[PDB]
Paper text:
Integrins are heterodimeric proteins composed of a single alpha (α) and beta (β) subunit. Integrins canonically exist in a conformational spectrum from a closed, compact state to an open, extended state, with the closed state considered inactive and the open state considered the major signaling state. The β7 integrin family, encompassing α4β7 [Lymphocyte Peyer’s patch adhesion molecule-1 (LPAM-1)] and αEβ7 (CD103), performs critical roles in facilitating immune cell homing, activation, and retention at sensitive immune barriers. Here, we compare cryo–electron microscopy structures of apo and ligand-bound states of the I domain–containing αEβ7 integrin and the I domain–lacking α4β7 integrin to illuminate how the I domain intrinsically mimics an extrinsic ligand to preserve integrin function.
At a global resolution of 3.4 Å, the ligand-binding interface was well resolved; we modeled the integrin headpiece region and E-cadherin EC1. We find E-cadherin EC1 exclusively binds to the distal surface of the αE I domain, using a short E-cadherin construct (EC12). Despite this, we observed that E-cadherin is only present in a monomeric state when bound to αEβ7. The αEβ7:E-cadherin complex is highly stable, with a dissociation constant (Kd) of 51 ± 7.9 nM measured using biolayer interferometry (BLI). We found that the αE I domain forms a salt bridge with residue 1 of the mature E-cadherin molecule, effectively outcompeting adherens junctions by preventing the “strand-swap” step necessary for E-cadherin’s trans-dimerization due to E-cadherin’s higher affinity to αEβ7 than to itself. The αE I domain αMIDAS is ion occupied in our structure, and the ion coordination complex is completed by E-cadherin E31. The ligand-bound αEβ7 integrin assumes an open headpiece conformation. In contrast to the unliganded structure, the I domain internal ligand is consistently engaged with β7 when bound to E-cadherin. (H) The β7 βMIDAS coordination sphere is completed in the ligand-bound αEβ7 via the internal ligand E372. However, 3D flexibility analysis of the dataset shows that the β7 leg still maintains a notable, yet restricted, degree of free movement (27° β7 hybrid movement compared to 68° in the apo-open structure).
Numbering used by the authors:
A (entry chain A): 1 to 139, 181 to 809
B (entry chain B): 80 to 458
C (entry chain C): 1 to 103
The structure:
């Protein structure tokens, strides 16, 4: 129909950007149109948003400046548009100290109508941002190195006590510290590693080799033991991590004897920077001050709580007090409840006004969902969720994913927000914000019919006549199953009197494809038919998967709006194979309704997976057709000339229609005396009247004079006194040549034929 | 001259499991003396005394919520294998596993928990994975018991578990799972709802799943993080295309979720993995007992001038109305059921006096032998 | 650490010399070779070498006869070093009394 699949503009194949979604944006105050595209992060892509405009019949792209910068893996980029501005959200990862699980919330930047930056938002510590009275308007780890003195001068009982201390500390640290890893060394005489950091990955094996270690007597080399621990255990060559905090536990009798390295040569060395030290006195030979001084020099600077005796198993708290961890309750374990840690605010979004935005929160409260109504100016918002106070069992509402999609409804009285919950009771539901007293909560209004269909994953209100109300609401069930996943899209008429929903139609793709995923992407494309109603577009990304050579697959359907609602059958079906090769998943994102091509008509955009296509639209010419005869009424027994005049003209005009009207062709035939066994009127040039093919020059008019006359041979004798009827049938043929302009098209909903009458003069008192 | 028909050997039917103890067809030898325009007839009977072969993939969830239920699955495997091996001589049983995708919202990504997902470091555990094929379909029962008795639990972040990916990959990975193309059964164990297509969006996975095999050499579905979970439609289509009947042995709490899935996947069955676990074994025996066959009578090439035809009769007086070659087949035979046939032979002219031919059931080891004597001359 | 009983050497004994009074025993000797060097007034400062110690055993020996009534007591110390040159035991202030003969 309108869409000009002849000349599609494509972003360069393979190279950047990698388009995940495309949307056109027009600045109201400047009438500039850009084709915005979001892309994931790579070593080549400069950012998550680009603006691309058509120059030299090529789509050229640049990065938007003040958008937030993604980092690390791809985790979601949302871009939504309204005549007030653009809102771009990026899912980001943050880890807090001593937390064993990470948070995942959004970072959003609101640019104005001209893509300059206006507002910023970081949804960490959401409990601060919340104001539950806000009116809703509607109009590294640690590593411990144990250096154990088996030098002799330590009777076996003391060795066993030290061994027990090691085992007890190890067990407690494994029980109550998760990111703790251990090492062990024994330096009586030679230095002898008993197990390494790499062994500590197995708690049972490391704990088991403790109680099996044997003594080595000889001589007390503390300095060499510590230097070896620094040089061969706290090093990456033996599994030591760069950022992990490092700790030591010297378990010695403080009797240093025959050691080459001054113990100050080691404690003041470069490598001991940043390494904690705990001393412990094994046995009892602290009769003199030398042992105490050595033991404390081993101990870190704050000698309090850094020197002990093996008998005090409570010695190494502080480490166990500071290294305590917390877990988000996960899949069978006890822990902190999920409130806002993984809310994913910004998953969906809708700009309501210059100040306020509405953000989906699919993950809040065990993935029940919600939506944060965020006032960017004051930086405060309200959380809107399903009410759990009616019945104490909120478990029935977990994993609903309310907020997977969000929309608004512009009823004649007030706005009314709706939110899709594509896993409600495993069917899916569409919620509507209802307000009563001092409370405002979501309640279930529509429900799906099949498990796993994802009913409510996409919503598209449509104002069919552009009057401020919302007449229909389209709800998507992209994974509906009959044979495969064909998809399905419901069409809910919206009542003006009551504001409730009533079903009108169920839409399904062209038969023969089992995996279309019809309903994945819906976008009200504004006015493409140039007739002041709202047309819709529905995508089917997987239509054609694996067919033939697999060059391209996908489809997009166009549903022209009508006075009584959305049309019954699509007016067009763009197929991937007819646009260009290499298009895969053509139809996953769609937008349009603005002039990006350079002429007054609206244009569409359909993003594939990895490319964006832009389609111009064609003028619609509806032809006025009129005629006259000579003589006006057939005389009695007329054998004379029947001269005709057949004048054509245009009935609706635009600049584009003027630009393109004049390189297509008109083709019209004349059928004379319709419906009779035999005709009364010839065509003096049979080749001509039965078929003509003319070219159209200027202005709006193109007329022709053609000749008829009485049928050859004997004249009719059975129907002389009745009227004749002449039917003109016109078709418009468009060459494929390289005409710069989009060539016109006749209206699909208007008859291509027009019928006139040629009377006859009866013999009665009144001829006609 | 006149024709004659005769039987040359005797053999009764039997009910053994193995070929020597089993009987498939009528006695082995007969004789027929044909003459021009004088057809003669023979009678045949068939019995399926042996059982069909079977293939059985046991696919169990190894998330942490299953720690209390692992005794049940470990016993279910044994109680299933004993029953099946008491009936069919040639069972094959495999084993696979699954936890979830390795992306943040589903599985924690911090390295410490990625190595040791369990709450405490004293627990015996294993790193998360999406699908880990552990034992290709084999006749070694002891291997299956030893392997199923060795796996350890993993962790996860969300109650939904991604077993749909495992089912799809089991369906699509035929060459390395080890399917024999005979009869297939999948026994899927879990105690949680399942992820479906659309859930991957939360983890940033945009690429729709595709119907191709993605098992590494070690058996892991490594590329899982890059594709979305399959839709129930895709799973149904794949299982149907591969003729696999699923049997969801699911906990009494996750049973209501899977009893609606049973309606979409047509041939499936759902049971409760109780402490007794006889109901699931009975379901699997009912699935095995659904197997039926259509028996056809093959025959050897006839000598010049000779012809042949068939007739069949099912249980009861029922015949087959399709004449000629159609009556050479009988359908809907199950365990220890029997059917019968009549084969007619005719001669137009003689060329060799002696001859021989052979017939049998379609693809069966036992066969029949016919000795022909076609004559033109007078007595 | 050290193991030393109270110390005394009577007045003006009969020879010959040296004579053993007490033993200056260290503690880390179980790991080996704790050598000695007595010092202080009386050993390495006048009166010269009145008391000297054997370097390995630790025997404190009197070198020549004594009298209190010239000096009442002789304070002393002991360095104690290992074979690697590092000190082991810090000095302990021995204090010997020539116990009077009531004359
Ligand atoms: C950007 O494009 C829009 C849409 O075409 C333009 O809006 C149009 O603005 C004109 C005035 O500039 C509006 O009035 C027109 O004026 C005269 C009578 O005064 C007459 O030629 C027309 O009948 C018309 O009334 C016009 O209604 C308005 N169109 C719409 C649909 O609202 C806008 O001006 C453009 N902006 C710039 C900066 O050029
Ligand atoms: C809808 O959202 C409301 C909040 O706007 C949810 O109610 C809240 O539910 C949480 C569940 O954890 C309650 O948290 C409480 O916090 C502490 C710390 O654990 C403790 O007192 C309790 O054990 C409990 O966990 C919270 O009090 C409660 N109310 C408020 C005002 O926050 C509600 O659950 C959501 N409904 C659904 C269906 O998701
Ligand atoms: C003008 O349009 C008419 C249809 O409105 C064309 O008529 C067709 O002519 C072909 C032969 O050329 C016939 O086989 C078809 O049955 C006719 N009708 C249709 C609907 O195709 C006519 O050909 C056109 N003229 C030119 C010059 O192309
Ligand atoms: C550990 O026990 C083994 C025997 O099981 C023994 O050979 C070894 O010496 C013991 N000691 C250590 C430190 O492993
Ligand atoms: C099963 O049959 C298919 C289709 O004929 C064949 O390609 C395949 O090799 C066979 N075996 C297996 C294990 O799939
Ligand atoms: C060690 O260094 C100190 C000064 O830090 C020095 O006095 C001492 O002699 C050195 N040697 C020993 C054995 O302590
Ligand atoms: Ca309206
Ligand atoms: Ca329209
Ligand atoms: Ca245009
Ligand atoms: Mn020692
Ligand atoms: Mn459980
Ligand atoms: Mn689980
Ligand atoms: Mn999970």
């Amino acid at each position: 129909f309108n869409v000009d699949v002849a000349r599609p503009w494509l972003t360069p194949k393979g190279g950047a950007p990698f388009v995940l979604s495309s949307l056109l944006h027009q600045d109201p105050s400047t009438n500039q149109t850009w084709l915005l595209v979001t892309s994931p992060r790579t070593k080549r892509t400069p950012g998550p948003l680009h603006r691309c405009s058509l120059v030299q019949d090529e789509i050229l792209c640049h990065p938007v400046e003040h958008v937030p910068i993604p980092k690390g893996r791809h985790r979601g980029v949302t871009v939504v548009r309204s005549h007030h501005g653009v809102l771009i959200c990026i899912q980001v990862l943050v880890r807090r100290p001593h937390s064993l699980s990470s948070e995942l919330t959004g970072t959003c930047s609101l640019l104005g109508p001209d893509l300059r930056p206006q507002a910023q938002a970081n949804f960490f510590d959401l409990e601060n941002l919340l104001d539950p009275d806000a009116r809703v308007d509607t109009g590294a780890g640690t590593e411990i190195a144990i250096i154990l003195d088996g030098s002799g001068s330590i009777d076996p009982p003391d060795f066993q006590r030290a061994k027990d201390f090691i085992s007890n500390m190890m067990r407690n640290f494994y029980e109550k510290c998760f990111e703790c890893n251990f090492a062990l060394v024994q330096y009586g005489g030679v230095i002898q590693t008993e197990f390494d950091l790499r062994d500590s990955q197995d708690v049972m094996a490391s704990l088991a080799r403790v109680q099996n270690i044997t003594q080595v007597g000889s001589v007390t080399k503390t300095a060499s033991a510590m230097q070896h621990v620094l040089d061969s255990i706290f090093t990456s060559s033996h599994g030591s991590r760069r950022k992990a905090s490092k700790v030591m536990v010297v378990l010695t009798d403080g009797g240093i004897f025959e050691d080459p390295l001054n113990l100050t040569t080691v404690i003041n060395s470069p490598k001991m920077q940043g390494v904690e030290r705990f001393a412990i006195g094994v046995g009892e030979e602290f009769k003199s001050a030398r042992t105490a001084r050595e033991l404390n020099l081993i101990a870190s600077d704050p000698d309090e709580t850094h020197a002990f005796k093996v008998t005090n198993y409570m010695a190494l708290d502080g480490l166990l007090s500071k290294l305590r961890y917390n877990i988000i309750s996960m899949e069978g374990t006890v822990g902190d409840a999920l409130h806002y840690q993984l809310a994913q605010i910004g998953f969906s979004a809708q700009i309501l006004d210059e100040r306020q935005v509405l953000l989906g929160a699919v993950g809040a409260f065990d993935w029940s969902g919600g939506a944060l109504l965020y006032d960017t100016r004051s930086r405060r918002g309200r959380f809107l969720n399903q009410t759990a106070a009616a019945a104490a069992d909120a478990e029935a509402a977990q994993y609903s994913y309310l907020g997977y999609a969000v929309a608004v409804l512009h009823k004649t009285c007030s706005l009314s927000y709706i939110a899709g919950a594509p896993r409600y009771k495993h069917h899916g539901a569409v919620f509507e914000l209802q307000k009563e007293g001092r409370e405002a909560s979501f309640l279930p209004v529509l429900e799906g019919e099949q498990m796993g269909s994802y009913f409510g994953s996409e919503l598209c209100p449509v104002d069919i006549d552009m009057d401020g109300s919302t007449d229909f609401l389209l709800v998507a069930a992209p994974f509906y199953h009959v044979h495969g996943e064909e998809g399905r899209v419901y069409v809910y008429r919206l009542s003006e009197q009551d504001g409730s929903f009533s079903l009108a139609r169920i839409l399904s793709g062209h038969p023969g494809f089992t995996n279309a995923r019809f309903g994945f992407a819906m976008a009200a494309m504004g006015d493409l038919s140039q007739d002041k109603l709202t047309d819709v577009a529905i995508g089917a990304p997987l239509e054609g998967f694996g067919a033939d050579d697999g060059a391209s697959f996908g489809s997009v359907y166009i549903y022209n709006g009508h006075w009584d609602g959305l049309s019954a059958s699509p007016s067009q079906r763009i197929r991937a194979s007819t646009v260009a090769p290499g298009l895969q998943y053509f139809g996953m994102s769609m937008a349009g309704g603005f002039d990006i091509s350079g002429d007054g008509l609206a244009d569409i955009t359909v993003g594939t997976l990895g490319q964006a296509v832009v389609f111009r639209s064609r003028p619609v010419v509806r032809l006025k057709v009129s005629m006259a005869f000579t003589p006006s009424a057939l005389p009695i027994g007329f054998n004379g000339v029947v001269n005709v005049r057949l004048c054509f003209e245009i009935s609706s005009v635009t600049t584009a229609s003027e630009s393109g009207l004049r390189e297509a062709l008109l083709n019209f035939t004349l059928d004379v005396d319709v419906g009779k066994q035999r005709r009364r009127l010839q065509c003096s040039d049979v080749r001509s009247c039965l078929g003509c093919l003319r070219e159209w020059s200027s202005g709006s008019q193109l007329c022709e004079d053609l000749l008829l006359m009485p049928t050859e041979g004997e004249l009719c004798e059975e129907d002389c006194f009745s009227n004749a009827s002449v039917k003109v049938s016109y078709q418009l043929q468009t060459p494929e040549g390289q005409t710069d302009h989009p060539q016109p098209i006749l209206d699909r909903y208007t008859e291509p034929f027009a019928i006139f009458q040629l009377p006859y003069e009866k013999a009665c008192k009144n001829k006609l | 001259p006149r024709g004659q028909q005769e039987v040359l050997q005797d053999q009764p039917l039997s009910q053994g499991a193995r070929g020597e103890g089993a009987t498939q067809l009528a006695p082995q030898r007969v004789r027929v003396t044909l003459r021009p325009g004088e057809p003669q007839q023979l009678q045949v009977r068939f019995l399926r005394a042996e059982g069909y072969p079977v293939d059985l993939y046991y696919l169990m969830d190894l998330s942490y919520s299953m720690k209390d239920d692992l005794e049940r699955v470990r016993q279910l495997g044994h109680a299933l294998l004993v029953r099946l091996q008491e009936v069919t001589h040639s069972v094959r049983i495999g084993f696979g596993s699954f936890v979830d995708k390795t992306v943040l919202p589903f599985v924690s990504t911090v390295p410490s928990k990625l190595r040791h997902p369990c709450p405490t470091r004293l627990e015996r555990c294993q790193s998360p994975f999406s699908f880990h094929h552990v034992l290709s379909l084999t006749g070694d029962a002891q291997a299956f018991e030893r392997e199923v008795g060795r796996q350890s639990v993993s962790g996860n972040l969300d109650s939904p578990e991604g077993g749909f990916d495992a089912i799809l990959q089991a369906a699509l990975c035929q060459e390395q799972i080890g399917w024999r193309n005979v009869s297939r059964l999948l026994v899927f164990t879990s105690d949680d709802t399942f992820h479906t297509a659309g859930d991957g969006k939360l983890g940033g996975i945009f690429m729709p799943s595709d119907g191709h095999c993605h098992l590494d050499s070690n058996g892991l579905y490594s590329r899982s993080t890059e594709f979305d979970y399959p839709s129930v439609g895709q799973v149904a289509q794949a299982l149907s295309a591969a003729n696999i009947q699923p049997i969801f042995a699911v906990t009494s709490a996750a049973l209501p979720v899977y009893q609606e899935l049973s309606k979409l996947i047509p041939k499936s069955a759902v049971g409760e993995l109780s402490e007794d676990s006889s109901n699931v074994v009975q379901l699997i025996m009912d699935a095995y007992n659904s197997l039926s066959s259509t028996v056809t009578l093959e025959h050897s090439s006839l000598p010049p001038g000779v012809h042949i035809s068939y007739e069949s009769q099912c249980e009861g007086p029922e015949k087959r109305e399709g004449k000629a070659e159609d009556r050479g087949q009988c359908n809907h035979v199950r365990i220890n059921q029997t059917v019968t046939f009549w084969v007619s032979l005719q001669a137009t002219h003689c060329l060799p006096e002696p001859h021989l031919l052979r017939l049998r059931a379609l693809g069966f080891s036992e066969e029949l032998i016919v000795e022909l004597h076609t004559l033109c001359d007078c007595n | 650490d050290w193991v030393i009983p109270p110390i005394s050497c009577p007045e003006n004994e009969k020879g010959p010399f040296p004579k053993n009074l007490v033993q200056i025993k260290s503690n880390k000797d179980k790991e080996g070779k704790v050598f000695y060097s007595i010092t202080g007034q009386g050993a390495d400062t006048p009166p010269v070498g009145v008391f000297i110690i054997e370097r390995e055993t630790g025997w404190l020996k009197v070198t020549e006869p004594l009298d209190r009534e010239r000096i009442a007591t002789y304070t002393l110390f002991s360095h104690a070093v290992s074979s690697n040159g590092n000190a082991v035991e810090d000095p302990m202030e021995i204090l010997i009394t020539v116990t009077d003969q009531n004359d």
